[PDB]
Structures are given as structure tokens and as C-alpha cells.
């Protein structure tokens, strides 16, 4: 009847605010510490958690995330560690989606990964290198195991492809990138009432507030990894600052 993340965005939209969406990669700095960090995010007030699956050739990841995922892989991180992370988040009372490049999902098995993601309490999948054009197996797996499918749109997206991507998405649309972010969010609002998340290299409280004025979600990742590298207390402090940002 409705998406898995829909009640989270309605609860935010009822409290007159945007959702804070927090990315961390599994296994950085090691697997136990990363899970303890993801639990800390739930406590520090993240509405949704993006659990990153480290990939050997992460085409779209920036330098902070790329080096962290490289380090997680050196440390022996495995795809199953991500599903353990989703379970620990869900028991703690948080809401988790998985962000992954597509080959790890193919290798695991698209149906099997959906099945096991859903059994861990996972709510959906963010797919940076999977366009709807190739998503037939994922569409079927998503419908059967009741998982949201968050595709990405871009400033460069043609009108036709923007429409097709928004139509194929359930839960929210990850609008990735001067006035480009609000213009892209505007073009999604013109064809659909689906929530839009915005990832813009957010570092601070003021930046999260600006984004909350037009986006239903603020996505933070790079800054969270930078914070965890200095320390786990530094992550709590930053996450609390960003929690206040989205309520403005």
C-alpha cells in the first residue's frame, strides 16, 4: 500500500522538519567499531541510516569515503558484516537502508540479498550504479521482499529520464550533486510527491538547515566519516549539531 520509509518522512513532515539521513561504511575503522558508531547515530538522532557496503572500485565515492572503504577492505570486511550492521541498527530502534554498488548484489544473488536484507530488518537499497534500465531483477526482488528502491537523479538528468527514475523509485529519490540542488529538487516535485533526499557535501548545522528548507531529507556521509576518524565522541557531537539543523 505504501513505502517502508513513508511513515518516517510523514513523522518529519508532521513535526515540520526534514529527516537526517546518515551514511557510514561497514568495517571502518573495523567491524565492531563501525557498528558501535552506527548505534551512536541512532542515539544522536539520525532518522535513517545508510549502511555502506565497501566496494573495491567505488566510482562515485569521494576521497573521504573511498579511503575509508579501502581501509575497511584491507581489514577484511565482508558483505555479511553489512547485514549484521543492519540487524544491530534495527534492534537499537533505528531505520536502516543499504547503499551498495551493484556487483556485490549480483554475486550474492539479487533475490537472496533482498531476502536477507529484509530479514535483518533492512528497509531498502540505494543503488548508485544501477539505473532503472537494468533494474528488472531488482524491481521484482523489491516488490516481493517489501524494500524501498532509492535511485539517484542528477542535475544533468534529461526530463524523460528524470520522470522514469522518479516513477521507478519507492521511499525517496537521492538527488545527488550553486542553485543546482534546489532546481533538481524542484523538477522532481513537478512530477511526483515522493520524498527527495539531498546530498551536497554537508559539513555543518547551517548547511543542513539550508537544505531542509526545500528537501524532505538531508543526506550526510563524508562529514560523518571525518568525524569518526577523529573519535566516536566527535561523531555524537556533530550528529547532534546536524539534528538541530534539520529542525530549523
Amino acid at each position: 500500500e505504501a513505502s517502508r520509509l513513508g511513515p518516517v518522512f510523514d513523522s518529519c513532515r508532521a513535526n515540520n522538519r526534514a529527516a537526517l539521513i546518515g551514511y557510514l561504511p561497514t568495517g571502518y575503522p573495523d567491524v565492531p567499531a563501525s557498528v558501535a558508531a552506527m548505534t551512536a547515530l541512532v542515539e544522536s538522532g539520525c532518522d535513517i541510516i545508510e549502511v555502506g557496503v565497501p566496494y573495491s572500485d567505488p566510482g562515485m565515492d569521494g576521497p573521504t569515503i573511498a579511503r575509508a572503504t579501502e581501509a575497511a577492505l584491507r581489514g577484511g570486511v565482508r558483505v555479511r558484516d553489512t547485514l549484521a550492521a543492519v540487524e544491530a541498527i534495527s534492534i537499537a530502534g533505528g531505520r536502516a537502508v543499504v547503499m551498495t554498488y551493484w556487483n556485490p548484489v549480483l554475486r550474492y544473488g539479487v533475490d537472496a540479498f533482498a531476502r536477507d536484507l529484509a530479514a535483518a530488518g533492512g528497509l531498502g537499497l540505494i543503488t548508485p550504479d544501477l539505473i532503472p534500465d537494468e533494474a528488472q531483477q531488482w524491481l521484482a526482488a523489491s516488490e516481493e521482499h517489501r524494500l524501498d528502491r532509492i535511485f539517484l537523479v542528477a542535475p544533468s538528468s534529461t526530463p524523460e529520464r528524470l520522470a522514469a527514475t522518479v516513477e521507478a523509485s519507492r521511499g525517496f529519490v537521492y538527488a545527488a550533486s550553486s542553485q543546482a540542488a534546489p532546481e533538481l529538487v524542484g523538477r522532481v516535485k513537478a512530477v511526483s510527491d515522493i520524498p527527495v533526499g539531498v546530498g551536497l557535501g554537508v559539513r555543518s548545522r547551517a548547511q543542513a538547515a539550508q537544505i531542509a528548507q526545500y528537501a524532505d531529507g538531508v543526506i550526510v556521509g563524508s562529514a560523518l566519516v571525518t568525524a569518526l576518524t577523529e573519535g566516536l565522541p566527535r561523531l555524537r557531537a556533530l550528529t547532534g549539531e546536524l539534528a538541530a539543523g534539520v529542525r530549523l
Binding site: 572500485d57 558483505v79 554475486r107 539505473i131 544533468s156 538528468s157 534529461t158 529520464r161
Partner: protein, 399 residues
């Protein structure tokens, strides 16, 4: 045609080889290039321009040469060398580059980027950009800049900027990753001149269409010189452009065996190879669903080869399709086998091959022993060895 993919870039229907495994951020320019290729491939102006340059600039056709002094080392079979080594810049890469570079200018793009491993695609790209007045940036892995240094200096002399890539394995796959990131950021002004028959649609089809000329010439030349179609046609396989180029014209001749030879490095049992078909499995990598070397979770495994050109853990999707269909067989050749054949071609025929092409000659020698006396084997001699003279002189103790 019978061999082309659907409009999404899929070969073989529900096997699903090829396609586009790319971010939405790239789809506007990927769709732009696809449309421009479909328009220009039937434009007589474009084909006339490409033809004029192939003849007068690049030196086509390349000859077909019967290497009779190799015959005793190949079970008395008859080895014919398709001499892509004599093209301008010294390899087959120039064929694809002139096509894509003319296309970049037709689209109004003002900047060209490319990846290179052996430096031959880099040099060809720089060459075409000099010729057409386009800004050029070549991405090259740091281990490749060191072992193919002659080509770095040629690129710089040709006016191309070269960026040494220090991430991952510092070889071809890592150069491709960096050039991809550049294209994502600079898509509106930049054309990505991709040098092998992999990637998202339209690159596998387009690269093969520009390399097809090799096989079309070879098919005519062998019938002229030998009086019949060959018993086999063989080539080395990196990402797959020279192999698919020579194979394509023989696909519908059922008695012509097609064999691709991939790099096995220290040996397939050692975990230091680039033997994608022998040891890899299906997956999505660098824009396509094809074969790649990957671990149990689907992390790309780093390849290794003495040859910078074959040191790539992937392979192009049309090859995956031809392997599935049983039309082409793919076999491993080690560093040692390749270098033995390198030395042999030097001493018997006076031809210094690329170490890439040496893998194909080594495989041809073994296939000659299987097929026997009088068997006619066409080998694509993809490049010359200028760039590898230091490596080979070190290998044979000539210093």
C-alpha cells in the same frame, strides 16, 4: 546486424551481456554519444573523412605476411601475421581513435580524455587530438608510466597532458576509474575516447565497428594469398578490441576456428594473472555485464601481467557472448610463453612485436602443433615492440 545488441546494449537476449552499469549522472552524455554515433555511422561525409585518414594518415591497409620461418616452430602450419604493428603510432588503437576523435568534433566537444595501460591508446588519442586541435588528457597508472615510459614522452611531445594514477593497482583498471570520474564531472564539454571493446553501450559496439576493418582486410587478403579461408584466426585479448576487430568478419564462416589468448602472468594457479575467462566469472564492472576476476563477495581482483596492455581483470561483453555461444575459445598464455615467442619472432622474421601481440604468437605456435602441417592460421599482430625493448632486453640479459 545478426551480431549487434539491442537498443539497451545487450548481447544474447536474457544472458544480458553488456548494457549500461553507470550512474544516472553519466546517462545524458552516454545517450548523447550513442545518438551521435548512430547519426554519423551512416553519414557519407563522416565515412569519407574516416576513410581518407585511414588511407593517407594511418597507412591502411596493413599487410598480411606469411611468416615461413616460424612454420617449423608451429608443427609446420602456416602462420600469417596481420601487421597492425605497421599502422601510424604502431598499433591497432589508431583505428578506433580516428573514428571516436572525428565523432568528438562532430558533437562539438572541446576536450578529449582517455585511459592507457601500454600507452598505445594514449599515443593514438594524443595523435588524433593534435591532428584535430582538441585538448587532450590521458590517464595512466603509475606502474605503467614507469614500464612504458617511451609512450609517456611521445604523448607529451604530441601535446597531450598526462596524469599518473596512483590508486588501486596503478594499472589500466585504475586509469579507467580516474577517467570515468573526470567524465562524470566534465560531461558537458568532454568526450571519453575509450580504447577497448568494453564499457557501457555504446562503447563495445562502437569500438568493434571501428576495428572491424582489420578482419575485413584479413578475410580478403588470406583468400588472395592462400586461396581459401583460414583454419583459424587468433589474437591476444586485453579488454578485447584487436581480437573482436579481426574476428568479426569470420563469425559467419563456420569452419574458421577463433581463439583468443589471455594473459596468465606467472601462471593461472598463482593468483598473479589476467586470465579472465579461465579463472573469472560473470559480473558488472566498468559499465558492462561481462566476465571479470572477482572474489567471493564480488570485489574486483587485481590482475598481473608482464604486458601492460593485457593487465586488466575484465573483458568486453561481446566476447562473453561469443564464449557462451561456443563460437570463440579463450586460452591462457603465461609471461614465459609470451617472451619465448617474442624472442622467436625477433630471430626468425625480424619483427619486434608488442609483448601483448607476443601472447597471440605464442598461442598460434601451440595451435599449429594441434592443427598440423599445412594448416593456415591468421594471427593479429596488434602492435610493435618499441615500448617493450628495455623489458625484453632485460629479460634476455642483453645489457
Amino acid at each position: 546486424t545478426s551480431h549487434d545488441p539491442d537498443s539497451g546494449g545487450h548481447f544474447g537476449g536474457p544472458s544480458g551481456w553488456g548494457g549500461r552499469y553507470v550512474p544516472e549522472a553519466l546517462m545524458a552524455v552516454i545517450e548523447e554519444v550513442t545518438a551521435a554515433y548512430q547519426k554519423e555511422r551512416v553519414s557519407q561525409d563522416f565515412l569519407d573523412d574516416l576513410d581518407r585518414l585511414q588511407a593517407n594518415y594511418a597507412g591502411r591497409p596493413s599487410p598480411l605476411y606469411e611468416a615461413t620461418r616460424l612454420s617449423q616452430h608451429a608443427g609446420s602450419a602456416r602462420i600469417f601475421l596481420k601487421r597492425e604493428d605497421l599502422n601510424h603510432t604502431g598499433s591497432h588503437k589508431i583505428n578506433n581513435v580516428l573514428g571516436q576523435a572525428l565523432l568528438a568534433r562532430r558533437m562539438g566537444k572541446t576536450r578529449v580524455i582517455a585511459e592507457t595501460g601500454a600507452g598505445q591508446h594514449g599515443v593514438a588519442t594524443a595523435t588524433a587530438c593534435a591532428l584535430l586541435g582538441l585538448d587532450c588528457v590521458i590517464y595512466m597508472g603509475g606502474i605503467d608510466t614507469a614500464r612504458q615510459a617511451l609512450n609517456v614522452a611521445r604523448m607529451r611531445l604530441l601535446g597531450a597532458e598526462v596524469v599518473a594514477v596512483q590508486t588501486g593497482s596503478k594499472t589500466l583498471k585504475d586509469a579507467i576509474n580516474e577517467a570515468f570520474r573526470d567524465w562524470v564531472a566534465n560531461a558537458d564539454n568532454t568526450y571519453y575516447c575509450f580504447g577497448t571493446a568494453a564499457g557501457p553501450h555504446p562503447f563495445p559496439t562502437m569500438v568493434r565497428d571501428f576495428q572491424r576493418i582489420i578482419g575485413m582486410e584479413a578475410r580478403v587478403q588470406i583468400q588472395g594469398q592462400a586461396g581459401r579461408l583460414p583454419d583459424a584466426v587468433v589474437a591476444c585479448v586485453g579488454g578485447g578490441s584487436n581480437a573482436i576487430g579481426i574476428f568479426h568478419a569470420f563469425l559467419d564462416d563456420p569452419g574458421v576456428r577463433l581463439v583468443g589468448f589471455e594473459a596468465a602472468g606467472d601462471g593461472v594457479e598463482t593468483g598473479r594473472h589476467a586470465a579472465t575467462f579461465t579463472a573469472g566469472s560473470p559480473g558488472a564492472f566498468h559499465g558492462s555485464f561481462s566476465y571479470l576476476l572477482q572474489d567471493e563477495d564480488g570485489q574486483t581482483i587485481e590482475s598481473h601481467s608482464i604486458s601492460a596492455g593485457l593487465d586488466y581483470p575484465g573483458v568486453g561483453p561481446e566476447h562473453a557472448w561469443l564464449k557462451e555461444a561456443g563460437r570463440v575459445d579463450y586460452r591462457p598464455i603465461t609471461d614465459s610463453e609470451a617472451m619465448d615467442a617474442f624472442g622467436l619472432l625477433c630471430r626468425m622474421e625480424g619483427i619486434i612485436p608488442a609483448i601483448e601481440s607476443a601472447h597471440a604468437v605464442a598461442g598460434a605456435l601451440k595451435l599449429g602443433v594441434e592443427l598440423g602441417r599445412g594448416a593456415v592460421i591468421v594471427v593479429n599482430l596488434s602492435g610493435r615492440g618499441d615500448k617493450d625493448v628495455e623489458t625484453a632486453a632485460k629479460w634476455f640479459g642483453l645489457l
